[PDB]
Amino acid sequence: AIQLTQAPLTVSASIGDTITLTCRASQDISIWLSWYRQMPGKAPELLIYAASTLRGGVPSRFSGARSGTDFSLKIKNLQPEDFATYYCFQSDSYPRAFGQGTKVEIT
Amino acid sequence: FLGFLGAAGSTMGAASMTLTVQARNLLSVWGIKQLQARVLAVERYLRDQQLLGIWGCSGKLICCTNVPWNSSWSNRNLSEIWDNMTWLQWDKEISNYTQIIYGLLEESQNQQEKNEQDLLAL
Amino acid sequence: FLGFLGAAGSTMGAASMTLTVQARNLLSVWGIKQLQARVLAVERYLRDQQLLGIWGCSGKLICCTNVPWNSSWSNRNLSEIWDNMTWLQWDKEISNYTQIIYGLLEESQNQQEKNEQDLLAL
Amino acid sequence: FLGFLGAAGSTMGAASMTLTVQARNLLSVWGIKQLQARVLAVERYLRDQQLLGIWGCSGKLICCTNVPWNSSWSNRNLSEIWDNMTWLQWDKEISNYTQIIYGLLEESQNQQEKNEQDLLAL
Amino acid sequence: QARLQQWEGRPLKPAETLSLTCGVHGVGLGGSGWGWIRQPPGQGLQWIGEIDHDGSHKHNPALRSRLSMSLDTSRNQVSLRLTSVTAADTAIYYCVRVYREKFLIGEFLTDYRFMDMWGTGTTVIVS
Amino acid sequence: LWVTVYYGVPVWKDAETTLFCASDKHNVWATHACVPTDQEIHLENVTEEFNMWKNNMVEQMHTDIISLWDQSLKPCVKLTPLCVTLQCTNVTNNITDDMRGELKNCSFNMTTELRDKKQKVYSLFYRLDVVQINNKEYRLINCNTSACTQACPKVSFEPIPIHYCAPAGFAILKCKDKKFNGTGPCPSVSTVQCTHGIKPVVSTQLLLNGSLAEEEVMIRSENITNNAKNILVQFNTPVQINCTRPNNNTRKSIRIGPGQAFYATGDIIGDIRQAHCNVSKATWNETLGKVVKQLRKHFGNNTIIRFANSSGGDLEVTTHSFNCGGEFFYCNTSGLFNSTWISNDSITLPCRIKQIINMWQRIGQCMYAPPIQGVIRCVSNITGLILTRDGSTTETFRPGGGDMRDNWRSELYKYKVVKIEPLGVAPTRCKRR
Amino acid sequence: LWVTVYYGVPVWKDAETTLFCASDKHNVWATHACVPTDQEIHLENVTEEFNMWKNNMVEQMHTDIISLWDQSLKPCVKLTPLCVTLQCTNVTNNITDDMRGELKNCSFNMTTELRDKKQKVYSLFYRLDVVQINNKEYRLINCNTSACTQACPKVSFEPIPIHYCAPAGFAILKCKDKKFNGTGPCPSVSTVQCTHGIKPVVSTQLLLNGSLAEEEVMIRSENITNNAKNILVQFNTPVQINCTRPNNNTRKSIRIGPGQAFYATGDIIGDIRQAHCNVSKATWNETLGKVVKQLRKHFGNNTIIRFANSSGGDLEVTTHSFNCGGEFFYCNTSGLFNSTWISNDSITLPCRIKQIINMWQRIGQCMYAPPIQGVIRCVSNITGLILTRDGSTTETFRPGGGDMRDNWRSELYKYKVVKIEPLGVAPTRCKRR
Amino acid sequence: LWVTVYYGVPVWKDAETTLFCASDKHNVWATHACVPTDQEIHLENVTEEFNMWKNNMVEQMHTDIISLWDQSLKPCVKLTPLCVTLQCTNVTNNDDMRGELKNCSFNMTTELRDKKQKVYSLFYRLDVVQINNKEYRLINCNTSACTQACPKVSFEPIPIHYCAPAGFAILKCKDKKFNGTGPCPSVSTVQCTHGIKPVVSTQLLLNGSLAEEEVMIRSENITNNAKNILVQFNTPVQINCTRPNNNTRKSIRIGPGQAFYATGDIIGDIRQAHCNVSKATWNETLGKVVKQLRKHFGNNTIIRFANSSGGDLEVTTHSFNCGGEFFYCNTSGLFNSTWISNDSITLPCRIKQIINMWQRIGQCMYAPPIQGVIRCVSNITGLILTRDGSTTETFRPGGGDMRDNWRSELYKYKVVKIEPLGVAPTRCKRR
Ligand SMILES: *[C@@H]1O[C@H](CO)[C@@H](O[C@@H]2O[C@H](CO)[C@@H](O[C@@H]3O[C@H](CO[C@H]4O[C@H](CO)[C@@H](O)[C@H](O)[C@@H]4O[C@@H]4O[C@H](CO)[C@@H](O[C@@H]5O[C@H](CO)[C@H](O)[C@H](O)[C@H]5O)[C@H](O)[C@H]4NC(C)=O)[C@@H](O)[C@H](O[C@H]4O[C@H](CO)[C@@H](O)[C@H](O)[C@@H]4O[C@H]4O[C@H](CO)[C@@H](O)[C@H](O)[C@@H]4O)[C@@H]3O)[C@H](O)[C@H]2NC(C)=O)[C@H](O)[C@H]1NC(C)=O
Ligand SMILES: *[C@@H]1O[C@H](CO)[C@@H](O)[C@H](O)[C@H]1NC(C)=O
Ligand SMILES: *[C@@H]1O[C@H](CO)[C@@H](O)[C@H](O)[C@H]1NC(C)=O
Ligand SMILES: *[C@@H]1O[C@H](CO)[C@@H](O)[C@H](O)[C@H]1NC(C)=O
Numbered sequence A: 001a002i003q004l005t006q007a008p009l010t011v012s013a014s015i016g017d018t019i020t021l022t023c024r025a026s027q028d029i030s031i032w033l034s035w036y037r038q039m040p041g042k043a044p045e046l047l048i049y050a051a052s053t054l055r056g057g058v059p060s061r062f063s064g065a066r067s068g069t070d071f072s073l074k075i076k077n078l079q080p081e082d083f084a085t086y087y088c089f090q091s092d093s094y095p096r097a098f099g100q101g102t103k104v105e106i107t
Numbered sequence B, C, D: 001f002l003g004f005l006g007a008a009g010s011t012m013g014a015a016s017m018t019l020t021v022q023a024r025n026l027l028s029v030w031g032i033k034q035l036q037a038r039v040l041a042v043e044r045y046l047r048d049q050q051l052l053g054i055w056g057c058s059g060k061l062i063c064c065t066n067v068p069w070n071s072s073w074s075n076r077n078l079s080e081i082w083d084n085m086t087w088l089q090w091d092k093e094i095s096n097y098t099q100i101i102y103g104l105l106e107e108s109q110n111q112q113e114k115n116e117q118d119l120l121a122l
Numbered sequence E: 001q002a003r004l005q006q007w008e009g010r011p012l013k014p015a016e017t018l019s020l021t022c023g024v025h026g027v028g029l030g031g032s033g034w035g036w037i038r039q040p041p042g043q044g045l046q047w048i049g050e051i052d053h054d055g056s057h058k059h060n061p062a063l064r065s066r067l068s069m070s071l072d073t074s075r076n077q078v079s080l081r082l083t084s085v086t087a088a089d090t091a092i093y094y095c096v097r098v099y100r101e102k103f104l105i106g107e108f109l110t111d112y113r114f115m116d117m118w119g120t121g122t123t124v125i126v127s
Numbered sequence F, G: 001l002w003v004t005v006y007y008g009v010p011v012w013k014d015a016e017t018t019l020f021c022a023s024d025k026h027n028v029w030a031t032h033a034c035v036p037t038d039q040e041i042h043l044e045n046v047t048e049e050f051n052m053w054k055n056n057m058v059e060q061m062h063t064d065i066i067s068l069w070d071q072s073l074k075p076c077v078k079l080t081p082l083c084v085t086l087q088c089t090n091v092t093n094n095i096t097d098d099m100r101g102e103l104k105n106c107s108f109n110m111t112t113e114l115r116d117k118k119q120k121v122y123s124l125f126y127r128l129d130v131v132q133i134n135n136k137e138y139r140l141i142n143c144n145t146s147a148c149t150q151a152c153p154k155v156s157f158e159p160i161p162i163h164y165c166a167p168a169g170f171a172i173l174k175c176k177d178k179k180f181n182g183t184g185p186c187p188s189v190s191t192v193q194c195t196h197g198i199k200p201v202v203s204t205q206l207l208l209n210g211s212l213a214e215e216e217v218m219i220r221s222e223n224i225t226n227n228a229k230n231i232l233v234q235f236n237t238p239v240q241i242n243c244t245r246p247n248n249n250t251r252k253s254i255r256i257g258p259g260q261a262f263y264a265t266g267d268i269i270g271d272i273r274q275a276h277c278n279v280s281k282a283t284w285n286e287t288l289g290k291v292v293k294q295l296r297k298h299f300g301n302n303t304i305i306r307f308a309n310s311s312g313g314d315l316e317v318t319t320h321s322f323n324c325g326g327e328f329f330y331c332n333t334s335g336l337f338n339s340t341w342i343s344n345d346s347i348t349l350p351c352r353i354k355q356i357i358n359m360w361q362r363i364g365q366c367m368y369a370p371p372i373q374g375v376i377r378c379v380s381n382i383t384g385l386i387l388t389r390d391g392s393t394t395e396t397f398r399p400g401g402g403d404m405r406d407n408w409r410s411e412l413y414k415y416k417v418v419k420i421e422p423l424g425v426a427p428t429r430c431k432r433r
Numbered sequence H: 001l002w003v004t005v006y007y008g009v010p011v012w013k014d015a016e017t018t019l020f021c022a023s024d025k026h027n028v029w030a031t032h033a034c035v036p037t038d039q040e041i042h043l044e045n046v047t048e049e050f051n052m053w054k055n056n057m058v059e060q061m062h063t064d065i066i067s068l069w070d071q072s073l074k075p076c077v078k079l080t081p082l083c084v085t086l087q088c089t090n091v092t093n094n095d096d097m098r099g100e101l102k103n104c105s106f107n108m109t110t111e112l113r114d115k116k117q118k119v120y121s122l123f124y125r126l127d128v129v130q131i132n133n134k135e136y137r138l139i140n141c142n143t144s145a146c147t148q149a150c151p152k153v154s155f156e157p158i159p160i161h162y163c164a165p166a167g168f169a170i171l172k173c174k175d176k177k178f179n180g181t182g183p184c185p186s187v188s189t190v191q192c193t194h195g196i197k198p199v200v201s202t203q204l205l206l207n208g209s210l211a212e213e214e215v216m217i218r219s220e221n222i223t224n225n226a227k228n229i230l231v232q233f234n235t236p237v238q239i240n241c242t243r244p245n246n247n248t249r250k251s252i253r254i255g256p257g258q259a260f261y262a263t264g265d266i267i268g269d270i271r272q273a274h275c276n277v278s279k280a281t282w283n284e285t286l287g288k289v290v291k292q293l294r295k296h297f298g299n300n301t302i303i304r305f306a307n308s309s310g311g312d313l314e315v316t317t318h319s320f321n322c323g324g325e326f327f328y329c330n331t332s333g334l335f336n337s338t339w340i341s342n343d344s345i346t347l348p349c350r351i352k353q354i355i356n357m358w359q360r361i362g363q364c365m366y367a368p369p370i371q372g373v374i375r376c377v378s379n380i381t382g383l384i385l386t387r388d389g390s391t392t393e394t395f396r397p398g399g400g401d402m403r404d405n406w407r408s409e410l411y412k413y414k415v416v417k418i419e420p421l422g423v424a425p426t427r428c429k430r431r
Helices: B012-023 B030-054 B087-093 B098-119 C019-023 C032-054 C087-093 C098-119 D019-023 D032-054 D087-091 D098-119 F056-072 F281-298 F405-409 G056-070 G281-295 G405-409 H056-071 H279-293
Strands: A004-007 A010-012 A019-025 A033-038 A045-049 A063-065 A070-075 A085-090 A102-105 B062-068 C062-068 D062-068 E003-006 E017-025 E033-039 E046-051 E057-059 E069-072 E077-083 E091-098 E100-104 E108-113 E122-124 F002-007 F012-014 F040-042 F048-051 F086-090 F103-111 F118-126 F130-132 F136-140 F170-175 F183-186 F189-192 F206-208 F218-221 F231-249 F251-255 F261-265 F276-280 F304-307 F320-323 F328-331 F339-341 F346-354 F374-389 F394-399 F415-420 F423-428 G002-007 G012-014 G020-023 G040-043 G048-051 G086-090 G103-111 G118-126 G130-132 G136-140 G163-165 G170-175 G183-186 G189-192 G206-208 G218-221 G231-249 G251-257 G260-265 G276-280 G304-307 G320-323 G328-331 G339-341 G346-354 G374-389 G394-399 G415-420 G423-428 H002-007 H012-014 H040-043 H048-051 H086-090 H101-109 H116-124 H128-130 H134-138 H168-173 H181-184 H187-190 H204-206 H216-219 H229-255 H258-269 H274-278 H302-305 H318-322 H325-329 H337-339 H344-352 H372-387 H392-397 H413-418 H421-426
Touching (some): A004 A085, B012 D098, B030 B098, B030 D032, B030 F423, C019 G002, C032 D019, C032 G020, C032 G423, C062 C098, C098 D019, E017 E033, E046 E069, E046 E077, F056 F405, F086 F130, F218 F281, F231 F281, F276 F328, F281 F339, G056 G415, G206 G320, G231 G281, H048 H168, H116 H258, H229 H279, H229 H325, H274 H325, H279 H344
Parallel strands (some): H302 H392
Antiparallel strands (some): A019 A070, A063 A070, D062 H002, E003 E017, E100 E108, F002 F423, F231 F276, F231 F374, F251 F261, F320 F328, G020 G163, G086 G103, G103 G118, G170 G189, G218 G231, G231 G276, G374 G394, H040 H187, H086 H101, H086 H134, H128 H134, H168 H413, H318 H325, H372 H392
16 A cells, blocks of 8 residues: 655644645655645545645645655645644555644644 | 150150150259259259169169069050150050059069179179 | 168168168258258268269169178178178177278279279270 | 379379269358358269260269260370370360260260160060 | 535444445536545544445455445435444544546546545444 | 160159249349340140149249349338328419329428438328328328338339249240130140240239230130139230320439438429320220120120220229339229220320339338439330129120239240159060060 | 178168258247148167257257247337336226236327327236336336337247158157156167157246156156256146136237337226136145155155245246246246145136246347237146255255256157168178179 | 260369358357368379469458458447437547547437437547537438447457368469469369458558568559559568557447447547557568569669558558457558668557448448557558559559458469369270
C-alpha cells in the first residue's frame, strides 16, 4: 500500500496569516492527491482535488502544488473557518490511504 | 442411324441392332431438383446392372442364359416374335411373366457359380 | 429362403448359398439428409464393385483366385471353417490380414492382365 | 510404388503397370457443394465403365480389342510409342481421332456380340 | 440541494452485523461510485471500501472477508454490512461519492476519483 | 428355345419425374440458374396414348412457375410501412368521364431512413387498391390480409421461353398429329430431349402469345358433354390485340427506410385517359366463325351457338387479366363475347389497372407492382380461348379461366414423359455354354 | 488352398449413419416429408453386443426432433410486439382458493393492422408468464432474453409415431430378448427393415405413452452404482393418468399486424379451477411395489427403498412437464413419490399451466402456446420413470429429467445400426484358370 | 497393330470444379462448413503449364470467403434502431484519439416496445454524417442497415485447405523461380493445398507465405500499367499495430435479447493508432524489390515509390483487421523513395466501426468496440503495386480487389481432371 505522511501534526497561526501544509507520499502517486477539511464536529469537505484544482465554492486563497512526492497546500488570509483538521487522500493505488491530519488552530 | 428410341417401331430383330443407342442414354431447392434427378438415374441404372451381374450377364448387351423358355409365358414361334412384333408389344405380353423369369435367371447363375466353383477344385 | 442377413448365424458353407440375398440389398430434415444417404449407398457399392473388377472378379459373387492362402493368416482346415464357423466369426479372425490379402489380389490380377496381353501378341 | 499420377512422366510402357493406382482414385449452402461433387464423380465413373462395357472391356484395365490400327491416327511404331512417349504426350496426339476409335470399338463389339450369339444357336 | 443523508443506527452489541444506509438526494447512484469512510474518535479517517462506476467492489485489506456493500438503485441507497463488529470499530461512518474527473497528464488520460460529496455522520458505538 | 436377356431395348412405361430447365437483367422465372439448351427423332410405326388432362408436366410447371415467382420476391421490399391511414382525395385533374373516380390522390405519413423522423408523402392510388374506412380516410386493400412485397424494379415480368427437359433414363414423347384432341392414340409420335420454348404467359379468358394450331381451330375439352369442364380453344391464325395505358405516369421514389425504397405514382403528365385494348372487328368476327364451325361438330349442326360474357366472381376471372409492360391490366372482354350464331373498325375493351396483385389465387401473398414511367403500349397475339358452357337448341359459351394450369395445358398437350425400360427377356435358340 | 473372394457375405460392424424417417392437418414432426412405410427377419445363432447408452440413434433422434420443432415455428407469427408494459390486475372472479393469483387480467396497447393506429386490448396471462416491473405493471417473463414465436394454430403437437429406417447397405438389429438390461450380449437378435412407431412424447419424470416391458419391470442404468446416472424404469403394465384443465378458456384473436394475429385468453366461462392429474392410488402403489422388487436386485434385500420428490431446479425438471391438448402442464408429482419401503381412491397432482414454453433447454427460443378453446381432458399411460438416486441401509430415489434424450433412450434401447461389409475372403481349393 | 484400351492412364486435362474446404469458439470461416484433414507425390519428368492469373481456385475462394462471411453474420444483431438522429458533441473541444471521436447522444428502443432509452456512445467521425450539439446520423443509414459484428465470432483467419473431389487432382508447382505463368519443371500432386489463411488486407500482404530464394515479381502483363504487380518477399517485414487507448465497451439493450455494444468511455494512452515498421528492414526490403524490379524495366531506369493516388479509404490505406478492430493505415512513409542506378517508421492509422468489407454496397457491418488495449504483430509478406503510365517508373501501392490477396497464395496450385481411359496400338488381338 501507499502511506501518506502529513507534518507538522499541529500548526498554530493567528487570523490573517499564511500557512503551508505538507503531505509526503511513500511512492510517487503522480498528482492524484485530494485535500479534505474537517471542521470539529462536522463532516469533511473537499477543498482541492488533483493537488491543484480548487473545488467549486472554495475561495481562491486555498492552493496546492507539486506532482511528485512532497505535496503542499497553502492557505492565505486565514479566517476562523479555516481552523480545522486537514487530510490528504491519495487516489493512485486501490488500497486507498488518508493522511494523519494537520490540526490548524489559533496561537 | 435412327437415334435414341429410333427403332422403337422396328421389329424385335431389327431393334436389337441398336441396343447400344438406348444403353448410353440411360446415364447422362432448384439445385436439389436437378441433383435428385441425377441420383435417381444413377441408382436406377445400377439396379439394372446389378440384375445383369447376378444373372451372369454383366458387361453384355445380349446375354444367353440356361433357362429354357417355358411355353406358358408365350407359345408363339420364333419366326413371329423377331420379325413381326416390336419390343413394346412384347413387353406387354410377358409383363406378368417377367418376375418369374427373373427368379429363374438368378437361380440359374448361382447354380452355375457353384458348379463351376466345384469343378474348378478338381 | 431365409431373408436378408438370414444366414448370419449359419455356417460359412451354408451362408455362401445366400450371397444374392445380401447383395441385392446393398443398393436400394427429411430432404438433403435422405438424399445424401442415397449417394453414400451408391458410393459404398461402387467402391466394392471396383475392388472386384481390379481383382478380376467383376460380375461374380464367388470368385476363385490365384493367390495362395498363406497359412499365417489362418491355420484352420477347410472342414472347421466351412462347417463350424460363421462369416461374422471368420471376419473377426482375419480382420487384420484383410489389407495384405487385398494387395495380393490386386497385384496378382495385374500380373494376369499383362500375361494374357503377351499371350495374345503371338 | 510411385503413388497417384506418379507415373505421369514415365513412358507409356512403364505407366501401364500402375493403372490400378489411378483407377481406385476416381471414386473417393456448402452441403450441396460437397454432395453435388460426389454425384458428379459417380456419374463420370459410370460413363467410363459403360464405355468399357459396350466395347467388351468390362472389368478389365488392359483390354486388347479387335479394332485394327489405321496408322492414319499415328504412324509411330511400337518401339517409339511404348518406350519414348508418355501417356500425356500420346493423349495430345490422338485427341483428334479419339471419337473415331471410340466408334469403331463400339461397332466391332456389337458385331462380335452377335457373331458369338449366332454361334451358340448351332 | 444535492445531499447525502444517513441516520443513526443506535449502539449495537459486539459480535453482530453493522447495517448502514445512506440516502442519496439531488443526484442518483448512477455514473459515480459510492464508498464508505469512517473516523475513530481522536484519530484520522480510514477507508473502508467503494463501489466504482463499473460496479466493482474495492475493499480495504485490513477488513478481511467481513465487508459487503450493495447499491439500491430503486431507492437510491448505499448499504454497508460489516460483520463481527469489535470494540475497535467504534467510529463515525460517512457515505461518500467518489466522482470521476478525467485529468490529462502529458499523454495519458486517467479517471480520477476524489470523494466529491460526503455524508453527515453516523456515530456507531459498540458496548 | 432359351431365355436370353437384352439390355437397352426400346421399351418405355408412362411415368412421372422432375423435369429440369433449359433456356437459350434478371427475370422472375430465373432462367440464368437454368441450364442452357442445345435433336428430333421420329418414331415410325409408334402409336402412343396421350392425355393432356392427366399430364403431370402441367402440374409440375404450375408448381415451378409459382415457385419461381415467389423466389424473385424474397429479395424485395416488404411494404409493411405502407399499411397506414391514407387521407385520399379524388384526382379530378384533366380526367375523362370514363376515368371518373378510378384514380385517388392519397397522402400519408410515411417512415424515413431515420427511425425518429416521419415523412408526409403522397401518391396516386387506383380505386381498386384502396378501401375506405368508416378528405376521407382510406387504407390499402392489402392490409387486413397481408403485406405486399414490392416487385423489385429490376426483376422483369416478361415471359421468356423455357424448356422442360427430362433427366437420364426418361424420354419426352411429342405427338406430331396436327388434328389431335389431346387424348387417345397419336399415329405420329416423336421423341425429343425436351420441349419447345414455352413462355409462361399469365392471362385469363384469352391465351396470349401462345402456339397456333397447324390447320384448323382445335377445341380440346376433357369431355364436351360435361359443362363443368373448361374448353380450351386454339386458333389456327392469331388475333392481335393492342393494349395501351395512355396515362403518362411519373415514378416517384420514397425512401421508407435504410435501404428500402417505395416507388409511388407522382403525377400524370398531361391528360388522363382510360386504359384499353383493341381487337379488329373483322378479324375477331372471322375467328369466332371458325370457332363456331368447329364447335358445332360436338353439339349438332342445327344448334345455336351463343357467346356471352363472364358470369361473375373475382375481377381475375370475370376480366381478361394479364400483364405486359409491367402493369397488370383487367380488361372487360364483353364486346368480344357478345353474339348469337344461327345455322378498319376495332373493338375497344376498357381495362382497369391494379397495383396490388394476388397472382396465383393465393391469399396472404400479395405483390405491389411499382408504377411504370411513361406510356405503355403492348401488342400481343390471342392464340386461344378458355370457354365454359352452361347447362334446348342453344348453347351459351362464356369465357372462363382462373385456374392457371389451363394456360400451360394448352402448350404441354402434345408432350408426354415416359420411363425407358431397357431390360427385356426374349426367347432364342442360343444357349450359354 | 487359394484365396476366394465372396461378395454378399452376411457380415456387419458397428457404424453411425443418418437414418431416415418413415411414417404409416400438419404436424410438428412432419410426416408429409417422411416416406411411407411398408419386414423382420429372425437371426438364429446370432449374438450381438448392444449398448443403449452409447447408441447414436438416440443422439440423432434428439437432433431430428429439435430440428423438426424449430423448422415448424419458422413460418408463423413472431410475437415481438407483445413485449410491452402490461397493466395487470388479479382474476378474483370465481377463483378457487388453490388457483388464487395465478391468472392475471392484463391490458395493453397493441399495434393495429394499420401502422399508425393503436389498439387497447386485454388478455388473461398466467402468473408464470408475467414478471412485475418496478393496477401494477407487468411484462412477459421472456422479454429480456428473446422474443417469442407464437405456436402456429394449425400445426399439431400430438406425437405421431415415426419409424427411423436405415439406408441401403445398413441394417437395424433389434434385440428380442425380454429381459435385456440395455447393455451386453443379446442372444435373440432379429433384423428389421426399421423401427416400430416411436412416438416423440416430450415429458419429464414420467415416460408417457411409451412401450411396456414384456415380462417384468425393467430397471436400466448406465452404471447402477453411480448415483449421478439417471435410472430408467420401464413398467410391464401401464398406469393411466387422467389430465384435465377444468377452465373453459375462450380464445380471442388480436390483429397485431398485417396478416398477423395474436390469440389471447378472452375469459373463462365459469369458475376458475386448478388443472390436475389423477393417478389411481391402488395401481400406483402396486406399481411402485413392483419397481421396488426389481430395484432391490441391485441394492440388496434388506435395503430400505425411499421415494422422495424432486431435489430442485427449474420448473421443467422439478415437475412432470408434459403437453397434451396443446396446453403445457407442469404437474407436481410430490404425491406420487412419497413413501418408504421396508423388507377407488385417487392421487391428485396439482398442475400449473404455462404459455411461454422453452422446452429443449435453449435460452433464447420461446414458443407462445395459444389458448385452447373449451375444456381439456387427457388420458395417458405412465409407462416408465426417470429416477435419480441420492448420494447407510437406506436408498432415496427422486424423479429426474430435463435431458430429453433419456425419454427416447427408453424407446431405442433395443435397436442398433450396423453396416454390412459384404466383401469377404476365405481359403478354398479353387484355382483360377 | 490393333487398338487396345487402357483404363487408368495418368492423363489429365485442365478443369474447373468445386473444391471442398478442409481444416485441422466459432469462426467466420468456421470448421462447421469444412471437413477434417488427414500426401504429396512428386511427378517426375512432368512439365505442366500454370497460369495464376486465370486460375479458378482464386475465383472460387473469393466466393467462398464472402459466403462464409455473410453466413456468419445472419444469426446476430441487425442494427435497424441505430438509424435515429444523433446529437453529437466533441469529446476534446480542442492530435489525440479524442479528436477522432464524436460523443453522440440518441434515443434508443428498450426491451419493452413502448419505452425509450436516452443513451450515448462515442462514435468515430468516420461513421457519423451531419444532417443539415449538432445533429448527425450513422454513415451507412441511407444505403442499408448494419448487422452488428456478432461478439462471439472471431475475425482471426484460420488456415483452410481446398481439396479436390474424386476424379480430380491438384497440381502443385514446386519451382522456386516460377513467376506465375508458363512451364513448371517440378510438379507434384498434393491431396490438397497448404493452410491458406484468408487474411483480408490492402496494399500489403500481411502474414502468409514467403518466397523461397528471392523477392518474386508477379504481374499478368508487366508492360501493362493497368495490371497490379504482386510482389512477394523472401524475408518478412514485421509490422506492429496498436490502439493505445483503454476502451470501455458499454452494452445497450435495443430490444428483447438484442444488445448494442457501444464505446462508453476512453481513457489511457490517447495517442493515435499506429503501425511501426522497422526503417532498416523496410529499406533493405525495398532494395531487394527494386533489384528484382529493374529486371523488367532496365538497369538504368529510376524506380520511384510514391503513395496511393486516391479513392476510397479502403483503397488509399492499408486496410486490415487486427484484434477485432479495423485499422486504416496511411502507408505514405512506407512508399516514399527514389532509387538511382533501431529506428522505426510510424504509420498513422484511423479506425472505423462500420465496415463495407467486400467492396459492396448495401451490406455493412458494425464492428463492436474491443475492450482494452489492442496490440498487433504481423508479417508483411508481399505487396500489391500499380505502375504509372521517360526514364522514371513510379510504383504506387494498389489493391481493392481482394482476389489479388488470395491469388498470391494459390499461384502454385492447379486443378486438373483425370482422363483415365486411353487407347493405344499393341500387338494384341482379342480371341
Ligand atoms: C459524453 O457525453 C455525456 C453526456 O451525454 C457525458 O456524460 C455526462 O458527464 C457529465 C460530467 O461528467 C455528468 O454530469 C455530472 O452529473 C452529476 C449527477 O449525476 C447524474 O447524472 C447521471 C447520468 O447517468 C445519473 O445517473 C445520476 O442519477 C444523476 O442524475 C440525477 O438523477 C436523479 C434521478 O435518479 C435526478 O433526480 C433526483 O433524484 C433524487 C432521488 O432522491 C431526488 O428526488 C432529487 O430531488 C431529484 O432531483 C437528478 O435530478 C439528477 N441530477 C442531476 C441531473 O444532476 C453531477 O453531480 C455532476 O456535477 C457536479 O459535480 C462536478 C464535480 O464536482 C462539478 O464540476 C459540478 O459543478 C457539479 O458540482 C456541484 O454539485 C455538487 C453536488 O452534486 C457539489 O458537490 C459541487 O460543489 C457543486 O456545487 C455532473 O453534472 C453527466 O451526468 C453525464 N451524463 C450522462 C448521460 O452520463 C460523458 O461524460 C461524455 N463522455 C465523454 C467521453 O466525453
Ligand atoms: C416401320 O415399319 C416398316 C414396315 O415394317 C419398316 O420398313 C420400317 O423400318 C419401320 N420403321 C422403323 C423406324 O423401324
Ligand atoms: C380424342 O380422340 C381420340 C382418337 O379418336 C379418341 O379415342 C378420344 O376418345 C377423343 N377424346 C375425346 C374427349 O373426344
Ligand atoms: C447389464 O447386463 C450386463 C450383462 O449381464 C452386465 O455386464 C451389466 O453390468 C448390466 N448393467 C447393469 C447396470 O446392471
